[PDB]
Design an enzyme around this catalytic site. Structure first.
Site, PDB file in Angstrom:
ATOM      1  N   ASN A 250      88.945  21.111  67.413  1.00  0.00           N
ATOM      2  CA  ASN A 250      89.225  20.573  68.716  1.00  0.00           C
ATOM      3  C   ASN A 250      90.285  21.493  69.342  1.00  0.00           C
ATOM      4  OD1 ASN A 250      88.320  18.091  69.917  1.00  0.00           O
ATOM      5  ND2 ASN A 250      90.714  17.691  69.911  1.00  0.00           N
TER       6      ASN A 250
ATOM      7  N   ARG B 234      95.161  29.121  71.685  1.00  0.00           N
ATOM      8  CA  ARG B 234      96.018  28.117  70.742  1.00  0.00           C
ATOM      9  C   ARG B 234      95.918  28.695  69.571  1.00  0.00           C
ATOM     10  NH1 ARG B 234      98.407  23.048  69.607  1.00  0.00           N
ATOM     11  NH2 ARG B 234      96.472  21.991  69.688  1.00  0.00           N
TER      12      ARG B 234
ATOM     13  N   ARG C 121      96.922  18.905  62.717  1.00  0.00           N
ATOM     14  CA  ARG C 121      96.648  19.731  61.577  1.00  0.00           C
ATOM     15  C   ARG C 121      97.667  20.341  60.786  1.00  0.00           C
ATOM     16  NH1 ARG C 121      95.475  20.568  66.397  1.00  0.00           N
ATOM     17  NH2 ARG C 121      93.648  20.767  67.419  1.00  0.00           N
TER      18      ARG C 121
ATOM     19  N   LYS D 152      81.519  22.005  59.878  1.00  0.00           N
ATOM     20  CA  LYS D 152      81.791  23.192  60.939  1.00  0.00           C
ATOM     21  C   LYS D 152      82.670  23.901  60.267  1.00  0.00           C
ATOM     22  CE  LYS D 152      83.938  25.524  63.924  1.00  0.00           C
ATOM     23  NZ  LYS D 152      82.900  26.296  63.077  1.00  0.00           N
TER      24      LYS D 152
ATOM     25  N   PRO E  77      77.490  27.743  61.295  1.00  0.00           N
ATOM     26  CA  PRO E  77      78.504  26.832  61.746  1.00  0.00           C
ATOM     27  C   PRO E  77      77.775  26.359  63.161  1.00  0.00           C
ATOM     28  CG  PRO E  77      79.638  29.110  61.233  1.00  0.00           C
ATOM     29  CD  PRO E  77      78.053  29.215  60.879  1.00  0.00           C
TER      30      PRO E  77
ATOM     31  N   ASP F 232      78.579  24.047  66.240  1.00  0.00           N
ATOM     32  CA  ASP F 232      79.615  23.469  67.191  1.00  0.00           C
ATOM     33  C   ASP F 232      79.266  23.432  68.566  1.00  0.00           C
ATOM     34  OD1 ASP F 232      79.671  26.092  67.420  1.00  0.00           O
ATOM     35  OD2 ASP F 232      81.646  25.966  68.445  1.00  0.00           O
TER      36      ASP F 232
ATOM     37  N   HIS G 136      79.413  25.296  71.363  1.00  0.00           N
ATOM     38  CA  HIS G 136      78.638  26.639  71.534  1.00  0.00           C
ATOM     39  C   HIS G 136      77.300  26.742  71.025  1.00  0.00           C
ATOM     40  CE1 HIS G 136      82.204  28.482  73.868  1.00  0.00           C
ATOM     41  NE2 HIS G 136      82.853  28.137  72.753  1.00  0.00           N
TER      42      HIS G 136
ATOM     43  N   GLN H 297      67.976  10.096  64.220  1.00  0.00           N
ATOM     44  CA  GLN H 297      68.304   8.803  64.566  1.00  0.00           C
ATOM     45  C   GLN H 297      69.039   9.128  66.300  1.00  0.00           C
ATOM     46  OE1 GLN H 297      69.284   4.743  65.865  1.00  0.00           O
ATOM     47  NE2 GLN H 297      67.306   5.874  65.136  1.00  0.00           N
TER      48      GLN H 297
ATOM     49  N   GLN I  13      74.010  34.175  64.525  1.00  0.00           N
ATOM     50  CA  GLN I  13      75.036  33.231  65.236  1.00  0.00           C
ATOM     51  C   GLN I  13      76.272  33.821  65.745  1.00  0.00           C
ATOM     52  OE1 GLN I  13      78.753  32.088  64.969  1.00  0.00           O
ATOM     53  NE2 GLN I  13      78.200  31.366  63.097  1.00  0.00           N
TER      54      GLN I  13
ATOM     55  N   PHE J 268      77.273  33.815  69.630  1.00  0.00           N
ATOM     56  CA  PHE J 268      78.584  33.170  69.601  1.00  0.00           C
ATOM     57  C   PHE J 268      79.631  34.230  70.502  1.00  0.00           C
ATOM     58  CE2 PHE J 268      82.860  32.106  68.470  1.00  0.00           C
ATOM     59  CZ  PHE J 268      83.007  30.771  68.665  1.00  0.00           C
TER      60      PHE J 268
END
Length: 313
Positions: A137, A142, A192, A237, A254, A256, A258, A275, A303, A307
């Site tokens: 997140n 950052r 975190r 992830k 991984p 996510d 993207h 489901q 990936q 990515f």
DNA sequence: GGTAGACCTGGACG
DNA sequence: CGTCCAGGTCTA
């Protein structure tokens, strides 16, 4: 001579590992969000910590030039350069993998032209574990800062080039110390801040310390992935990242945003047996399997190729 | 077992 | 300036 070196300014101090841009593209690997510890201090010159040492990397068409700051100046030794080859996994031939993914996939074979030299860094488990705990997140911009301040706070001081001081990635003992979380919040690591502290103590007090973690390079992907998630701030992830980038599990995929967009836009994928319809635990696991069958044993490296393309897009 | 609701924060957009 | 979002994980 001070500051960061360049191939031009200090020629006598650079050794070169044979490597074509097709095999490795620094500008498509280091800032791509695998490691958050490489900066292009100088144009086409990437500096950062490698094996408790600072390096500056730049590449020509057929060579990758390297310079190391260990108190006597000297071009890298044969063994020091080996540390570099190990890091970029220069034994894994990208040309081959690219041919295979392009051979069994069309969309890849298309994007696999503009984006070459995209391989995976062989990262240290610790640095990788805590770095990707901060990724959830959050944006690459950052995360880099957070990891930089984290290292400045609890990381061993290495050397100083210009107005930049480099720090080895903090240790478990460092991250488990008293009041770390309170400190890490001051560095704006947010919620975190607890994940780091908790995981540091969890590993070092309930799992068996560093040994436990490193020994996952021998375990199986399923084993290791299962092992990691019990850590605070570590889900599927984040686990897939650590496995893929540090734990030698190339089939780790991984999943996510993207990867979910790419899996909906470029592959028109739709949750067969699930489901839900969105990124629920179940689907994500299924999506990964889809790429492992499509691309094979190295669905992870594939990936990373897409990515990266998706980021600079 | 399967689901939204939230979170620290800093940069984009409407 | 409020709403969303970025390499998601932990929750009644």
């Amino acid at each position: 001579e001070f500051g960061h070196r360049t191939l031009a300014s200090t020629p006598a101090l650079w050794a070169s590992i044979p490597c074509p841009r097709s095999e490795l593209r620094l500008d498509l690997v280091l800032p791509s969000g695998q490691s958050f510890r490489w900066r292009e201090q100088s144009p086409a010159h990437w500096s950062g910590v490698l094996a408790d040492q600072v390096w500056t990397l730049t590449q020509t068409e057929e060579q990758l030039h390297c310079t190391v700051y260990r108190s006597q100046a000297s071009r890298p030794t044969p063994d020091e350069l080996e540390a570099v080859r190990k890091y970029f996994q220069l034994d894994v031939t990208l040309a081959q993998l690219y041919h295979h993914w392009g051979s069994v996939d069309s969309h890849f074979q298309e994007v696999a032209q503009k984006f070459q030299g995209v391989r995976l860094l062989r990262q240290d488990p610790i640095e990788c574990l805590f770095s990707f705990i901060c990724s959830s997140n959050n944006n690459i911009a950052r995360i880099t800062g957070m990891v930089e301040r984290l290292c400045q706070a609890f990381g061993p001081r290495l050397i100083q080039l210009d107005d930049v001081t480099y720090h080895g990635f903090p240790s478990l003992q460092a991250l488990a110390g008293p009041e770390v979380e309170a400190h890490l919040r001051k560095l704006g690591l947010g919620y975190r801040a607890r994940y780091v502290s908790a995981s540091a103590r969890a590993i070092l007090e309930e799992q068996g310390g560093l040994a436990w973690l490193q020994q996952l390079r021998e375990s199986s992907y399923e084993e290791a992935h299962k092992a990691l998630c019990i850590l605070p701030g570590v889900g599927t992830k984040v686990a897939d990242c650590i496995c893929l980038m540090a734990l030698d599990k190339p089939q780790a995929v991984p999943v996510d945003v993207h990867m979910w967009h790419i899996a909906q836009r470029d592959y028109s994928w739709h949750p067969t047996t699930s489901q839900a319809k969105g990124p629920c635990p179940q689907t994500n696991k299924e999506l990964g399997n889809f790429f492992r069958s499509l691309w094979g044993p190295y669905a992870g490296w594939a990936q990373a190729v897409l990515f990266s393309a998706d980021l600079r897009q």
